[PDB]
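Sample 1 of the test manifest.
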Amino acid sequence: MDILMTQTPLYLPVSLGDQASISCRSSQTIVHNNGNTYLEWYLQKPGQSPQLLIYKVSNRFSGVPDRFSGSGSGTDFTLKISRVEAEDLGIYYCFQGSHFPPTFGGGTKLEIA
Amino acid sequence: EVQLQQSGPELKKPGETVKISCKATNYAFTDYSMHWVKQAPGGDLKYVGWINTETDEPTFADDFKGRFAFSLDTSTSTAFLQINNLKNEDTATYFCVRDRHDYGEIFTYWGQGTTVTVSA
Ligand SMILES: [Cl-]
């Protein structure tokens, strides 16, 4: 637990169809010695284990809807959801695996209400 | 279709020991390291460490080296996480996780998690 990952906002109450944005700020830059920035976003649906959504800052994982996109500079990264669907409910986490030990953000709760 | 199956929830008394298992299927167990993550009440995720499945050597993150121990049963493609001298602070759901290319850079596959509850 060294590189702090802070997410904004911690609670994201939204409504179907609306857009959603989650920010993640790292306390240090996160570029691996090999030049890659291993910044991933995970979604943990209720009653499930986390699942990978975005890796390498902006690459969508297999089967991930196009509504999910990622961006980010040196210490500030963003996960955006064009249109929020009922199946998007859950907790989102950013994660850096660029420097040891790998660290996760504290989680952002997306709740539709 | 990688599958990581973990053992059931545990309700333990303080000071006792708990041993969690993670059964891997559909891939060569010894080709990928097994990582372990601790999810504390509230949802925070903390990296515990990883075990090299080919050499059976563990590497832990911040203070976990103390009472946590990783082990393997390569013949049954199973990884274990044992917690000795259970403390209230250990209450959490533990996950075994496998990465994409065995570099611990991208956690792709996760077990369903094992909730450990330390009572009174
Ligand atoms: Cl990897």
